[model samples]
Target: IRDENYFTDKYELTRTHSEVLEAVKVVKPGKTLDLGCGNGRNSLYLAANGYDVDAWDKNAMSIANVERIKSIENLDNLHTRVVDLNNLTFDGEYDFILSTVVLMFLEAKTIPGLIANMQRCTKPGGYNLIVAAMDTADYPCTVGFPFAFKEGELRRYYEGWEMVKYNEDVGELHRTDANGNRIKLRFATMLARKK
Candidate 1:
């Protein structure tokens, strides 16, 4: 089983995910928030590109790993915290808010409020990018936990926002074994411009 630390692959010791990079291309350097920042994959990209980044995660490993690198990289624009996503709250607005693969782990019930909070935290006319796994066979539990998005339910979350880009793709994440083996995964990706 060519075992590897999934967290490290997804966040730490990594380059930014292509999808994430594409989603943020139009976003100019500004205040950014990375919800469930993991090990700062996105935050690192944001800070390196001149954005003032605020990120958080409940996983101590992630927080520690990210903090270590942020310092080593001298990313003074990056700020982070160990915060729970299940009850996340923020008192500020940002030019961009990223919530990739984060809502899938929250209680199915808490997602709506979380989306609302993300919306509130996003500055008007700014962008909010959300990516999550759509419901698939066998109820995949790949992360610390699992909860698949109901079919078409992902669209409901962005009812009032301007969808800059929306896609649902069945693809093998490059984050896989040397054999290039991976589970069949359905991902819902959204890049929205807040109204």
Candidate 2:
């Protein structure tokens, strides 16, 4: 698998993913954990919005970069860590778990385990936000390594949870191919709760 910056540019392109959560009518969370939080952008955003957040990424460099960004932003409510998703286990429960553009990296065989662990970390009545790349047969292109979910895959995974909102879009993906070709990618965004 490739290292950091796999979807670095795309992060800035996707505003709806973060903005939807920000628009939620609920109060800011007391404790939140951001799984696969690349560069801590979302975590920092949440921190600024009055949420105490702990963010982690498997990539060491990404974690370091997130720390630098956090320092630069002068954010106090956010903490950073380097963690492997395969072995993710947290002792304390969190009021919210936010993960965006991260789950597609896992192999199909590993998804259940990963989701189970994510569910375990959420406290009763807590929420989980997931944003994944939707599988589009029209233009099949991988982001670094090759992986994309088939349509409805994300919904099936969260079937047990109470789904608040689910959105899918065929959007522009700002990434150059090996031949320097820019591509448009499709994505799925979902917000669900554990009850």
Candidate 3:
């Protein structure tokens, strides 16, 4: 699996991720869990900003890379763990839970269980921030496997939670091709919050 390299390379788009993270309102010094944390770029950033973060990814190599990054950056507040979402189990409540560009890959049947787990990890009245590929009218077809959600599907999953912010927009997705030229793909971006 190229999971480690996929995220390490995506660090070039750190600003975009940071922009979305900033849009999420979070108080300092609270416990945070970054589900599907990948290479832990976002986790490192949040930890740098004083939040205690637990970063988890199913890829052990990715988690190891995160550990290396944390060591080099001297970020003491960040912890990395190898966890598979399909077999997820946790007990402690967190002040915030963040999942970005992750849920779409999950099987449709797993969504309810995933959302339930996310809600279970969240402290009562705490916030859960989620960002996924929006299921819009004109979503483009790409080569690799991709998941699409119908309109309102996401909202329905977060039902019973207060929606703080919701926005959907089309954006340019830059990628490299066989010729090494930058390829631009269209994507639907969304930001949602749990009550």
Candidate 4:
């Protein structure tokens, strides 16, 4: 791993995920739910742009950092919560929901249930953006995690939804292999609107 301390340390990483940035262009500002919002990268951006954001992550240190930023910026619209994704549920309805680069770390069995809950809690015409690792024959995920999606698997789940953007492509990871070459993994990125 090249940046092993990136997650634990209080790094000043403010770059929002490209997918999130693209999503904000289409999805209007409203009540938003950010699943696995590491360091509030996406949450902070949404909150600043008139969205009432509820960001949740299992990492305590990450949430603490997000809280620190919330305090520093006086962003009362952003709220942080430490939540275990393994046993997750959603009760409140939201206009936009985001889960980026997080499902691969969860148990495979729980994914369907979580996605179902996400769909259930989202308001009609709401948008859901998910970017997750995908395991393929040529560019398989080398990450130790075993829950990566199969090719087109994520798209299958959003069968009834209106797919605004969907792509299965490769992306560079923050970590590198032993040879110091950056690792690239396939990802299934989907942005759908509930019908």
Task: Please tell me which predicted candidate would have the highest TM-score against the true structure.
Answer: 4
Q: List the residue pairs that clash in candidate 1.
A: none
lDDT of 3 by residue, 1-195 (tens): 222233346444243264335644544358889889876767766777677899999999878887987787677889988987867777778888888778777666767787888787887667777766555556543524356556677667777877666555455455556655443333333344445
Q: What is the lDDT of residue 7 in candidate 3?
A: 37
lDDT of 2 by residue, 1-195 (tens): 111222235344223245335534553456888888776666766776677889889899878877876776677888989998866766668888877888778666767777787788888788888777766677464565345677777778777788777767776666545766656777777778777
Query: Tens digits of per-residue lDDT for model 4 on 45-143?
Result: 788778999999999998998898788777899998999988987699999999998899899988999999999989999999999888899887788
lDDT of 3: 0.68
Ranking by TM-score: 4, 1, 3, 2
* Model 1: how far residue 62 lies from native, Å: 2.1
Model 1, runs deviating above 4 Å: 1-12, 136-145, 173-181
- How high a TM-score does candidate 1 get? 0.83
Q: How many clashes in each candidate?
A: 0, 0, 1, 0
TM-score for each candidate, following the candidate numbering: 0.83, 0.75, 0.77, 0.88
lDDT of each: 0.77, 0.71, 0.68, 0.86
Q: Which stretches in model 4 have alpha-carbon errors above 4 Å?
A: 1-11, 174-179
Least accurate stretch of 10 residues (summed lDDT) in model 1?
Answer: 1-10
* Candidate 3 backbone collisions, by pair: 162-195
Cα shift from native, residue 170, model 3 (Å): 2.7
Residue 109 in candidate 4, Cα distance off native in Å:
1.5
Worst 10 residues of 2 by lDDT: 1-10
Identify the runs in model 3 with alpha carbons over 4 angstroms from their true place.
Answer: 1-16, 24-27, 140-146, 175-195
